[PDB]
């Protein structure tokens, strides 16, 4: 019938895209990335042990001037910190104690959060009154918020547990574009340096690139063994950094448009909860579930050194805008700035 | 160093004082996780003490603070956010005892009892819940006393082998629930048979959280 006709059409489309992407398999990355001088070992040490929280930390985001540092935790408090002096600036009392995402605006006037309350509360740091006030409370998601990255003072891009990514504003508070197409729940969200494109990763083991201006998808990168939990851009802006729940950091492109590789490692069988980048792009950093982080040489596909230091699993990890020091955030209510 | 730096560090230390003082009310608080099956009596246990995620209600019974984690509105999968409740003191289930007759009340494809068993096996043998107490409740049992008078109990469990009464069926459901636990050496299941208008279940919850905080006070001293 018509149902059988559309099932046959879906099968024919699957065969067509399989044949096209099998014919488009042309090159690889290993020899090109390994035709360079070998990268030496990296041995970092903790220089600022950031403490003050007393609950479990899931999220962090760096500052505008690579100096301030926001931290989200289940204590009902969002605290904005200081990297050098290990001081702190404000205390934001969260109305919802369940936060698993937070992001700091590139202008620094606003900070956002989100979690299991299925709403996004946008705060205002700069006020004539001495406090932090909620600017807009974004409502319209039926799932847990996973990432709340900022494009500018108005456009905030929010991932959520309703299998859709969203783009909002401030003057009205109404979502403009909805990014539908991920089957599973989106876990992380990474923008692009030119602030025109952004990527996402969901429970369907796929990474899909979305054009923010048109509100429609552009690319897909699937074929993985578990849920992708960590996504990150490249400083060049044309590469992925996928972190999933099988201790695998695959490297894709925003331009290769089908696939690059399926990277894996054998010594670690835990999960990955945060993946960050470096300024030169030669080295990759990932927050793991076996209580440490791994310094990944993105070219020779090697490890510069097991960069341990945390007692619990590193939930969140971030690198400054100038790449001067990394910062890991784990479940020990601590942050570990390393350089 | 400087006057701005001195005032900044004294303000930061004042906010650390605030985090200590307000955050030490978390030790007094005894948070409870509520989940299970919808329509099975979640509203009944709420009504005994705009957000589409976790619903919170606050109540204090005999000098003890409680938190209600109504997580039933989270329509997504439970795998990627149940890890936020590692340190919850007690878990409260509300599965309907009046469940052997009706299969879904929306369609004919499975049993709500089978779904309750699958969920119980999922969140009892969980790696993240290997040391957490359960206050599993078999609610609306007053209505269970009429549907067993006519419909035989073999329509759900074909291992009855006896006259269809209340106590044998209740014991069979108890045997089918209290065997899913992988180890009772570290877990207790505080099963209480309650109803829609049944009172004094709050003291049962209080006794259960009393037992788990006494095992906590045995834990922190290091001998247990």
């Amino acid at each position, epitope marked *: 019938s018509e149902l059988d006709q559309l099932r046959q059409e879906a099968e024919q489309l699957k065969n067509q895209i399989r044949d096209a992407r099998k014919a488009c398999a042309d090159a690889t990355l290993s020899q090109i990335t390994n035709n360079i001088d070998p990268v030496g070992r990296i041995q970092m040490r903790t220089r600022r042990t950031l403490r003050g929280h007393l609950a479990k930390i899931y999220a962090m985001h760096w500052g505008t001037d690579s100096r301030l540092l926001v931290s989200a935790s289940q204590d009902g408090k969002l605290i904005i910190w200081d990297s050098y002096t290990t001081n702190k600036v404000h205390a934001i009392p969260l109305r919802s104690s369940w936060v698993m995402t937070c992001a700091y605006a590139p202008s620094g006037n606003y900070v956002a959060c989100g979690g299991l309350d299925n709403i996004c509360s946008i705060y205002n740091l700069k006020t004539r009154e001495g406090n932090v006030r909620v600017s807009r409370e974004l409502a319209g998601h039926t799932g847990y918020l996973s990432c709340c990255r900022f494009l500018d003072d108005n456009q905030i891009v929010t991932s959520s547990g309703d299998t859709t990514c969203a783009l909002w504003d401030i003057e009205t508070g109404q979502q403009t574009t909805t990014f539908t197409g991920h089957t599973g729940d989106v876990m992380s969200l990474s923008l692009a340096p030119d602030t025109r494109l952004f990527v996402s990763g969901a429970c369907d083991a796929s990474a899909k690139l979305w054009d923010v201006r048109e509100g429609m998808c552009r690319q897909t990168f699937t074929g993985h063994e578990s849920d992708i939990n960590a996504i990150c851009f490249f400083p060049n802006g044309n590469a992925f950094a996928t972190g999933s729940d099988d201790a695998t950091c695959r490297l894709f492109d925003l331009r290769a448009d089908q696939e690059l590789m399926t990277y894996s490692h054998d010594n670690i069988i835990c999960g990955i909860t945060s993946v960050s980048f470096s300024k030169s792009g030669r080295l990759l950093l990932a927050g793991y579930d076996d209580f440490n982080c791994n310094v990944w040489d993105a070219l020779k596909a090697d490890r510069a050194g097991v960069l341990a230091g945390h007692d619990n699993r590193v939930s969140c990890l971030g690198v400054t805008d100038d790449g001067m020091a990394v910062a890991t955030g784990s479940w020990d209510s601590f942050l570990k700035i390393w350089n | 160093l400087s006057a701005e730096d001195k005032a*900044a560090v004294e*303000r930061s230390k004042m906010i650390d004082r605030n985090l200590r003082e307000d955050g030490e009310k978390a030790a007094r608080e005894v948070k409870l996780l509520l989940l299970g099956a919808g329509e099975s009596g979640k509203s009944t246990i709420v009504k005994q003490m705009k957000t589409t995620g976790i619903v919170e209600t606050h109540f204090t019974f005999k000098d003890l603070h409680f938190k209600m984690f109504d997580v039933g509105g989270q329509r997504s999968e439970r795998k990627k956010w149940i890890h936020c409740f590692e340190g919850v003191t007690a878990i409260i289930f509300c599965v309907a005892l009046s469940d052997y007759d009706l299969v879904l009340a929306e369609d004919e494809e499975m049993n709500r009892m089978h779904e309750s068993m699958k969920l119980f096996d999922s969140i009892c043998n969980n790696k993240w819940f290997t040391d957490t107490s359960i206050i599993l409740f078999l609610n609306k049992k007053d209505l269970f006393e009429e549907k067993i008078k006519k419909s035989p109990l073999t329509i759900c469990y074909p291992e009855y082998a006896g006259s269809n009464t209340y106590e044998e069926a209740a014991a069979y459901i108890q045997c089918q629930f209290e065997d899913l636990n992988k180890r009772k050496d570290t877990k207790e299941i505080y099963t209480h048979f309650t109803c829609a208008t049944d009172t004094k279940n709050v003291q049962f919850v209080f006794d259960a959280v009393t037992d788990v905080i006494i095992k906590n006070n045995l834990k922190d001293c290091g001998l247990f």
Partner: single-chain antibody
Amino acid sequence: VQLVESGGGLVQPGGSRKLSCSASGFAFSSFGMHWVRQAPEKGLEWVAYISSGSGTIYYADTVKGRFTISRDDPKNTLFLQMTSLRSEDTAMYYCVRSIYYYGSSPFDFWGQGTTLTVSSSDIVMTQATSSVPVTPGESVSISCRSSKSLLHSNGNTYLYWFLQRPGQSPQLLIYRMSNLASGVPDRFSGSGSGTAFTLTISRLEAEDVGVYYCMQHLEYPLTFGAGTKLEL
């Protein structure tokens, strides 16, 4: 709202008065409150300081143990208990709030002031210019010279520039490198890579009239500079 000052009037020499700051409409418990006076014919000078929650109380070197500054957090008020009111204290008093963190804006608000009339190794900075005749639309620079350097290993200069319109209260201007105040036009631009201070004002308007004041916050007391009246 605004910081409102209560009390005043003629007082006996060496006696006591009832001077307070009945201020409201602001988050009082987070600001490092100040008190700044000025003579009827002389510029401003710091006289008191308390931090948030009265954690740290400072004074000027000439007022140590002479005045009593206290705060009241629940009523958001600000007290000033006097002792031994000499005729040298014949000055009107301002109430100043100052928040203190990274990238904060101290001295960002000043009260309307109250008039107290008495009846019958410190760092020193000054402005050589005074009573400068200006014309609208013309670039007018300013000069302040400090005795000691204000830079650090971090690279932060602690110069503060102010403005008092005639018949009004002082306002705030540049206080860092390219960091202006709130409600201030962007024509102002402080400069000076050392212990010399200059405002490179691009254009002058009718609202850019008044007396400029040069300030430090490196050490206490927070003594001001000399008056520089930018009259027409």
